[PDB]
């Protein structure tokens, strides 16, 4: 928090806590299903799946292997997109709308063009 | 209101019925609305339950104990309860022919078990 600021330290600790809880709960989801959980555990498991694919953006030199364009997200755009998904502003979006995308503007354009 | 629960699955379970006719030990009794208390043994017959109109489901019960509670509740506890369309006519003749030849042919409980199997197979084959 003394090198990146108080805003960047809170977004990094929230994303690391949600990814660590979803990885340790993978052994219990395969033996008890996905509907045998509480209300807080069901909402955190849905947001952890979209957060793992949102950080994987397509590079500019890897356009011949995936087919998507290269996205170069800055430091200010990456911190604002991760804070809005953890607060509940993008809870109604799909899990495939954040894959192969970068920034908060790319997730809104890919979700509205997937259905219609 | 029926409670026809077997030892492997549930048929009636919830109270959503009207009339039910099950073969008991004495005669072919039939429960209506507010049935009286009667806990008689069920024989190997057909247990049909009329669902309001003509949507009756004929279930060939293997025999049990038809319990009638005082609060207009019928608990038909049977071992096996299958429909009439789940039986074959060719396979039913093989079991009845083998039980008739094995009756009064040996000793111990071999001849006594063949007499009960021949009577239950003849009643199910006549109701097709």
């Amino acid at each position: 928090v003394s090198v990146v600021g108080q805003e960047h330290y809170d977004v990094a600790t929230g994303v690391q806590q949600t990814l660590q809880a979803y990885k340790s709960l993978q052994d219990i989801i395969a033996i008890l299903g996905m509907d045998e959980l509480s209300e807080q555990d069901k909402l955190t498991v849905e947001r952890a799946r979209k957060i793992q694919r949102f950080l994987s953006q397509p590079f500019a030199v890897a356009e011949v292997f995936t087919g998507i364009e290269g996205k170069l997200v800055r430091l200010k755009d990456t911190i604002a997109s991760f804070k809005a998904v953890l607060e509940g502003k993008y809870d109604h979006l799909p899990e495939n709308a954040f894959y192969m995308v970068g920034g908060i503007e790319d997730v809104v354009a890919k979700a509205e063009k997937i259905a219609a | 209101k029926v409670s026809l629960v077997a030892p492997h699955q549930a048929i009636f379970t919830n109270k959503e019925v009207s009339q039910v006719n099950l073969p008991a030990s004495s005669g072919e009794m039939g429960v209506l609305a507010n049935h009286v208390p009667t806990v008689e043994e069920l024989a190997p017959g057909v247990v049909e339950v009329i669902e309001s109109s003509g949507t009756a489901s004929k279930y060939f019960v293997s025999g049990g104990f038809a319990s009638i509670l005082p609060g207009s509740k019928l608990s038909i506890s049977t071992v096996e309860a299958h429909p009439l369309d789940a039986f074959s006519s060719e396979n039913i003749k093989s079991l009845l022919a083998e039980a008739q030849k094995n009756a009064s042919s040996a000793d111990e409980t071999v001849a006594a078990e063949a007499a009960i199997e021949i009577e239950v197979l003849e009643a199910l084959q006549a109701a097709v």
Binding site: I31 | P7, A10, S25, T38, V39, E40, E41, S67
Partner: protein, 267 residues
């Protein structure tokens, strides 16, 4: 604590972790099929035995001690399955130690013989392998060495209250003399000429034994999955500690072997 001793201990601990992880995954698939048999046995126990609740059937005075039946399994590796079943039967036998015990497993008969060996009157082996059915419960009820000449007949088993833990419950079984002496037993139209009092106690013995065996098998399978997960987790911590000791021993063996060749070549 050499290189050969650390490699044999690390390889043997790795094989035990793979066998414990594969047994836990196989126990989860068997728990799904056993859940349908346990749920179906609970609905039959509330419909077939519904006449005893409306008639208020209870026992009274003791008639030549009583009779106990401990339902369990014959295999181990299930945690505290045999310890909880033996502790529940030993607490109820303090006020009546003259009653007989009918063990239905090798695990329940081994713990009961070290405390009350004279109380064991029947022993049944081979029931904990496959799942319980109506054929196994009807054969043990007819050959219980006069089971209808007792006042109280208890069935000690393990009831699965949840999908992780369990508790040892008990269910009483009335005889033919106690079924006809109830309060509201004459409310229903029953045939007094045929077998009505004796047929109610004989049919209730096979139904209570099948429901207790189905609940005990599901509780033992659920407890075995928790013990297999704890054994696989404990094997992973021991393999991590052995890997740190093997890495330090490998670096020390290379330094000790190089120091011996450098000392002899410089002299």
């Amino acid at each position: 604590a050499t290189l050969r001793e650390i490699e044999t201990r690390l390889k043997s601990i790795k094989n035990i972790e793979k066998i414990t992880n594969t047994m836990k995954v196989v126990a989860s698939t068997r728990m799904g099929r056993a859940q349908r048999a346990m749920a179906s046995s609970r609905a039959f126990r509330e419909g077939d035995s519904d006449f005893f609740a409306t008639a208020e059937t209870s026992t009274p005075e003791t008639a030549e001690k009583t009779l106990i039946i401990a339902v369990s399994s014959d295999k181990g590796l299930c945690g505290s399955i045999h310890s909880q079943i033996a502790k529940a039967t030993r607490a109820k036998l303090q006020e009546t130690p003259n009653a007989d015990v009918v063990t239905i497993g090798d695990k329940i008969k081994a713990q009961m013989l070290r405390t009350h060996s004279s109380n064991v009157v029947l022993s049944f082996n081979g029931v904990g392998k496959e799942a319980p059915t109506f054929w196994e419960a009807s054969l043990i009820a007819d050959e219980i060495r006069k089971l209808g000449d007792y006042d109280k007949i208890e069935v000690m088993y393990n009831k699965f209250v949840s999908g992780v833990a369990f508790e040892p419950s008990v269910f009483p079984s009335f005889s033919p003399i106690s079924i006809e002496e109830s309060p509201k037993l004459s409310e229903f139209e029953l045939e007094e000429d045929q077998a009505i009092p004796t047929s109610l106690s004989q049919i209730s013995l096979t139904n209570a034994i099948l429901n207790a065996m189905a609940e005990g098998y599901a509780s033992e399978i659920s407890a075995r999955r928790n013990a297999m997960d704890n054994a696989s987790k404990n094997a992973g911590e021991m393999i991590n500690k052995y890997s740190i000791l093997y890495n330090r021993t490998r670096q020390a063996v290379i330094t000790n072997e190089l120091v011996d060749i450098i000392t002899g070549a410089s002299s």
